[PDB]
């Protein structure tokens, strides 16, 4: 056993979701961590938020690492405001905390 | 055994990747398919492309479905051109083909 720290990708919503559904989902892609014990939290302008946050169970990858995702289900109005959103993943086995930041358009 | 068809999400690049690395990676998120036998292909304006396409092995999800991803590693110049990109996933077990389209900004 040699624990590996996670790596993040904070991605903007698909233009069709904003232009059709008027919703803007931010996807946080957490990959490469082992073992699977992970906690993902969100914050709007360095202030914690839990509303419309969808956390998914960890998935087993073929390179024997684990991967999970976190979804922040924002409205298009809130996403077009220009507020800073941060996805932060805490991984206790490796004692590491990785962060990713996205700004709006 | 009752095969399930995959569902796609075609996502744009993170603004920081375009503004810092001058590269624009398009992520195709294929989820919910069972069994894992899947083929993902890309096309630029309905014309097949294989250059800078990174396909990943299938991952086992906790709901007993499989999920995979496909990355189209475009340059920021090619992404800002306005060309239509289509991610299409073929799933032989369910005999289904799902498509997702993204347009540029
Ligand atoms: Cl990225
Ligand atoms: Cl990814
Ligand atoms: Cl979507
Ligand atoms: Cl997703
Ligand atoms: Na998204
Ligand atoms: Na992407």
Mind spelling out the 3-state secondary structure of chain A? CCCECCEEEEECCCHHHHHHHCEEEEEEEEEEEECCCCEEEEEECCCEECCCEEECCCEECCCCCEEEEEEEEEEHHHHCCCCCEEEEEEECCCCEEEEEEECCC
How many domains does the structure of chain A reveal?
A: 1
Six token digits for residue A102: 């996205």
- How was this one solved? X-ray
Q: What's chain B's Rg over C-alpha atoms?
A: 14
Q: Measured between alpha carbons, how far is residue A3 from residues A34, A73, B23 in Å?
A: 5, 31, 31
CA of A9 to the centre of ligand 2 (A): 6
Query: How many whole angstroms separate alpha carbon B39 and alpha carbon A100?
Result: 30
SS3 B76: helix
A70 exposure class (CB count in 10 Å sphere: 0-12, 13-18, 19+): buried
Instruction: Choose, out of A9, A55, A72, the residue to mutate when testing the contact with B (most B CBs < 10 Å).
Output: A9
Instruction: Please list, in sequence order, all residues whose beta carbon lies within 8 angstroms of the beta carbon of residue A18, skipping any fewer than 6 positions away.
Output: A24, A76, A79
Nearest ligand to the CA atom of B72: 6
Chain A's closest residue to B105, CA to CA, is A15
Query: How many whole angstroms separate alpha carbon A86 and alpha carbon B32?
Result: 27
SS3 B1: coil
Range of the domain at A92: 1-105
**Residues near ligand 2 ion, CB 5 Å cutoff:** A 29
Instruction: Please list, in sequence order, all residues whose beta carbon lies within 8 angstroms of the beta carbon of residue B22, skipping any fewer than 6 positions away.
Output: B75, B76, B77
Query: How many whole angstroms separate alpha carbon A5 and alpha carbon B80?
Result: 34
SS3 B3: coil
Instruction: Choose, out of A13, A15, A21, A25, the residue to mutate when testing the contact with B (most B CBs < 10 Å).
Output: A15
SS3 B19: helix
> Cβ contacts (< 8 Å) between B29 and chain A: which residues?
27
Sign of CA dihedral B13, B14, B15, B16: negative
The domain spanning residue B90 has which CATH number?
Answer: 2.60.40.10
Instruction: Please list, in sequence order, all residues whose beta carbon lies within 8 angstroms of the beta carbon of residue B71, skipping any fewer than 6 positions away.
Output: B25, B26, B27, B28, B53, B54, B55, B56
Write out the H or E segment, with its range, that includes residue B81. none
Q: A8 with A28: CB under 8 angstroms?
A: yes
Backbone angles phi, psi at A60, to 5 degrees: -80, 120
Of A14, A27, A58, the CB nearest to B102: A14
CA of B29 to the centre of ligand 4 (A): 6
CA of B11 to the centre of ligand 6 (A): 5
DSSP label at residue B62:
T
Query: How many whole angstroms separate alpha carbon B25 and alpha carbon A35?
Result: 28
Residues 48-87 of A with CB under 8 A from B: 57-63, 67
Chain A's closest residue to B16, CA to CA, is A102
Six token digits for residue B101: 């389209």
């Amino acid at each position: 056993v040699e624990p590996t720290k996670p790596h993040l990708r904070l991605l903007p919503p698909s233009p069709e979701e904003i232009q059709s559904t008027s919703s803007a989902t931010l996807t946080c892609l957490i990959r490469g961590f082992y073992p699977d014990k992970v906690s993902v939290s969100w914050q709007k302008d360095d202030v914690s938020v839990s509303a419309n946050v969808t956390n998914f169970p960890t998935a087993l990858e073929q390179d024997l690492t684990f991967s999970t995702r976190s979804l922040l289900n924002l409205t298009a109005v809130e996403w077009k405001s220009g507020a800073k959103y941060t996805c932060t993943a805490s991984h206790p086995p490796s004692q590491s905390t990785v962060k990713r930041v996205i700004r709006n358009q």
